């Protein structure tokens, strides 16, 4: 499997792959990823970091970025307390075993330089596009801020300053990146994951929605969050369960079945398991059960090493 | 005539009153303008500057702000192009017989303390009240930036910032200054100039606009505008040339006329001057003969200081 291959792997998209062609070809290449520090870190961080573990596998330099101010502008609480939580994530992340450097956004977000050139940008940036970039990150306010518009040219400038070879982020970031594209000088090579489903279905998995499993939840909330998930049978798209299985299972998986509902299966990749489902060939109940029993193996070293912090 | 009365004196509004009575108590009392530096000086700088020169004669120390970053963000270019002309507008200034200190908004609005407020007060200041607040301000822009949000909250911050007791503006500054005095913890004290008519009565005069009489004009220059300016018979709304009759001329003044058309009038004051006018007893030639040379008069001293420069 190519470099490549491995980094593009259950990505959604790579602005451009003829682009980060040339990145590859570097001996030194960084890629960095902003997170506004979250109470929970859940599956979607842990989707993201999985990807920056590609990247660092694939020889890349990886620098989190702990956003207190973009998570200040969006309405997250007072910076002291958006920092704390920030610290509590690194760990988080660290106990994921990722292999990074980790950077507060306002260490460098309100240099001088940075600030001028924060202005600079709001100049080229009309108030329809900022506004359209945020739609799908900002904090919900009947009585919009223009904090919401500074954001976007935050992260644009961010990716500017740092000089950073390639953005990784969610499928919800793709405004703000195309922004960057074309207001920097230098194109950012921009790689969006998808934004997982909530457990109900009703919308994308969001720490503030509780419809997460966290990563350090315990097995029995786990498997009480996976019977209750949203999961028809047939039915793969806005399928949270299936999601979990792409995203992050490996394969060939065993489904352990009773001999009466068919017996043990064996699928040897998503796709073969995809089918199966569609098929309406694997029972909702059974695919819930082997998901639910590999995620909490998948998650177990993690839980460990945030528990024997005590 | 009271300190208050002479400093009350052909403003559209102070906010508030008695504010204003409080602050006149102290001895150390301070009072800033902020200006976009402009390619001519007009005769809406000097109504200004004339304020600024009353409030320094009740006890004000005056700071006058080259406010090249609020250009920079207006659209008025480069930065560099803006600062030298702010140069420019400092001399003319000092022509007018104005002691003060002058300070470039950039010397302090790119400090990392002044730029956090920014964003703290952007959290604050919702979108549609900012561009609500920039309607009579902003260059116009069939394509509104960022930037034009950004401009409102700097004038805030920079009140805030910097301490003072009294803000003096155009009256279109008018909702910046309400929003100023609902966010900032100690209300500044505002004091609203009225907004010239342009010399052809179409709209409000500016330097962007060519409706205007610089304070440089050579006499026949003067001349010349004033006879082809707006100035209907019995008409005082809307009339640039009653404007400067009672915004710049002394009183008693007296109106030079041939004996054919009743002979030289001496009126008392502009109250006068304005029933004469409406009355049609008074007719816009005769009017607009002695605004001219009188105007001329007032201008003489400011232009032959910038002439002696060479
Ligand atoms: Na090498
Ligand atoms: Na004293």
Chains 1, 2 share one sequence.
Do not use: W
Request: hydrophobic share 40%; with cysteine.
């Amino acid at each position: 499997m190519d470099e490549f291959e491995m980094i593009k792997r259950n990505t959604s998209e790579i602005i451009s792959e003829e682009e980060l062609r040339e990145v590859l070809k570097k001996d030194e290449k960084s890629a960095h990823i902003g997170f506004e520090p979250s109470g929970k870190i859940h599956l979607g961080h842990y989707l993201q970091i999985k990807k920056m573990i590609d990247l660092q596998n694939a020889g890349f330099d990886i620098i989190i970025l702990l956003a207190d101010l973009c998570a200040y502008l969006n309405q997250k609480g007072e910076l002291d307390e958006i920092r704390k939580i920030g610290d509590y994530n690194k760990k988080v992340f660290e106990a994921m075993g990722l292999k990074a450097k980790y950077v507060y956004g306002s260490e460098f977000q309100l240099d001088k330089d940075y600030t001028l050139n924060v202005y600079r940008l709001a100049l080229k940036t009309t108030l329809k596009r900022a506004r359209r970039s945020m739609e799908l990150i900002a904090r919900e306010d009947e009585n919009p801020k223009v904090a919401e518009v500074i954001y976007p040219i935050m992260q644009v400038n961010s990716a500017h300053y740092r000089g950073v070879d390639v953005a990784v982020g969610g499928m919800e970031q793709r405004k703000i990146h195309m922004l960057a594209r074309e207001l920097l000088p230098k194109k950012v090579v921009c790689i969006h994951n998808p934004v997982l489903t909530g457990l109900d279905g009703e919308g994308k998995m969001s720490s503030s929605k509780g419809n997460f499993i966290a990563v350090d939840d315990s097995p029995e909330e786990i498997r009480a969050k996976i019977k209750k998930a949203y999961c028809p049978a047939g039915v793969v798209e806005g399928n949270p369960i299936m999601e979990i299985a792409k995203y992050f299972l490996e394969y060939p998986l065993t489904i352990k079945r009773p001999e009466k509902f068919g017996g043990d299966l064996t699928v040897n990749s998503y796709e073969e398991l995809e089918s199966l489902f569609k098929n309406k060939e694997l029972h909702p109940m059974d695919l819930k059960n082997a998901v639910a029993e590999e995620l909490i193996k998948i998650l177990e070293p993690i839980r460990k090493r945030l528990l024997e912090h005590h």
